[PDB]
């Protein structure tokens, strides 16, 4: 029992520390798929213009 409780306290602390480091990653789910499409067009144009 005493070993299990100590393991929970350690993992909980590690999670709290990682969530704080990842504050910028947690914002609004803009449709990742749309950004990639747009990027695809821009790159393709860039290549053609070069």
């Amino acid at each position: 029992m005493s070993n299990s409780v100590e393991a929970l306290l350690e993992i909980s602390s590690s999670l709290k520390a990682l969530k704080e480091e990842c504050v910028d990653l947690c914002s609004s789910v803009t449709d990742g798929d749309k950004v990639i499409q747009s990027l695809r067009l821009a790159l393709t144009d860039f290549h053609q213009l070069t």
Binding site: M1, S4, V5, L8
Partner: protein, 56 residues
């Protein structure tokens, strides 16, 4: 005749039925039974294992 609800998960023990009978006959008073109440914990080792499983 407190018709044992057949669907109660806990079936009445012979001890319980005997105690009930003794109380109905006025030979035993509920006060006498209350004063005799043993809070002795039953199955302590099984309870500890349940707590460990939850934490895990």
């Amino acid at each position: 005749m407190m018709a044992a609800n057949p669907w109660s998960p806990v079936q009445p023990s012979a001890a319980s039925l005997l105690l009930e009978k003794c109380l109905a006959a006025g030979v035993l008073s509920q006060n006498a039974l209350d004063q005799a109440q043993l809070e002795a914990p039953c199955f302590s080792h099984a309870e500890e294992l349940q707590r460990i499983t939850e934490i895990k």
